[PDB]
Amino acid sequence: AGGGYWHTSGREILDANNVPVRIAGINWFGFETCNYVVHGLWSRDYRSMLDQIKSLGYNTIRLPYSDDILKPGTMPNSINFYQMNQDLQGLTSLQVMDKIVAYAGQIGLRIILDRHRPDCSGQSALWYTSSVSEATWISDLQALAQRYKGNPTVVGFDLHNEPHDPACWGCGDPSIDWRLAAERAGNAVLSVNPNLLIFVEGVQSYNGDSYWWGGNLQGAGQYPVVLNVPNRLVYSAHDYATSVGPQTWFSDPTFPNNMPGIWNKNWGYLFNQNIAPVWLGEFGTTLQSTTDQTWLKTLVQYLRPTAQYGADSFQWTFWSWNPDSGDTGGILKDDWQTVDTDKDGYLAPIKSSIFDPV
């Protein structure tokens, strides 16, 4: 399954033949760093990396980027070309991206593009900065959509990674109201290719409740995102455990009984109420603490195991493939070859199936 562009039906995603599909994937980061390319291509051929990811079961890649790679002539600076990656030599960051998108499509993976940073120096709480403007943001998103227009390997865009304070949901002040910005961006995108899915994260705070960045969708119920094209909107949250940082509820004595409550309040409800599909776009942990391990165990059940519920379940993409994330660690170990199969162990129940070749 997975052929052609995709669409929504209630809380499910469907391919072009109206078969339900489940996004159950991984984050491979680096094109949003100042290396301007996915990491680990200093040790691995990229096709070999992609094959390993498929082999392990992940069917979708969330591909973080920054707007720096759209500056003309921007080039990767951490690729090894000895006996590997030979066809990437002399390519721009964008030419390299082309390459990754194609092989991945050829082998049954899918790609979601993620405006993860305005520039390679770091994330922004708002969708714009003094240096990178909304207009540039939007032009870039359109530039990328036009660039993959016709290749359903890229199924849609995560408009902006992890909006947070002082972003607001529905407050009406156009300088900080992410709900309105999201529509601006989204319709710009669908104006180029109306078959793409639009993934919108939450903010961090709402009606005095605060959650993880990009995780708070509590205001989406009353102030929904409305796009020019129907059946394109996927809401998305992020969630973490203590390896990333401290939250009141890990200390709650009834943990992790509390968790589904917190999840449902912040993003769960949209799925339970059948309003829209929901994507846990980013989540992970080093699994160093018992707490984190209960968390992951619990979370995985919450997301609805594929065997009991199939594609009528939460979409997800784990953080991350890369071992070089302090806070979470990765699927691969420091050698960029050896799998942390125990970690991979946890995600088994919610994995699903590779898609059809594009």
Curated annotation (Swiss-Prot):
Q: Which BP terms in the Gene Ontology apply to this protein?
A: cellulose catabolic process
Q: Which reaction does it catalyse?
A: Endohydrolysis of (1->4)-beta-D-glucosidic linkages in cellulose, lichenin and cereal beta-D-glucans
Specify where the region named Catalytic lies, as residue ranges: 1-358
The UniProt record lists the keyword Hydrolase: yes
Q: Which domain of life is it from?
A: Bacteria
Q: List the disulfide bonds.
A: C34-C120, C168-C171
**Any idea of its EC number?**
3.2.1.4
Stated name of the protein: Endoglucanase E1
| Family, per entry | Belongs to the glycosyl hydrolase 5 (cellulase A) family.
Per UniProt, what is one GO molecular function of this protein?
cellulase activity
Keywords (alphabetical) are:
Carbohydrate metabolism, Cellulose degradation, Disulfide bond, Glycosidase, Hydrolase, Polysaccharide degradation, Signal
Among its keywords, does the record have Hydrolase? yes
Q: What does this protein do?
A: Has a very high specific activity on carboxymethylcellulose.
The source organism is: Acidothermus cellulolyticus (strain ATCC 43068 / DSM 8971 / 11B)
Q: Where is the active site?
A: E162 (proton donor), E282 (nucleophile)
Comment on activity versus temperature: Optimum temperature is 81 degrees Celsius. Thermostable.
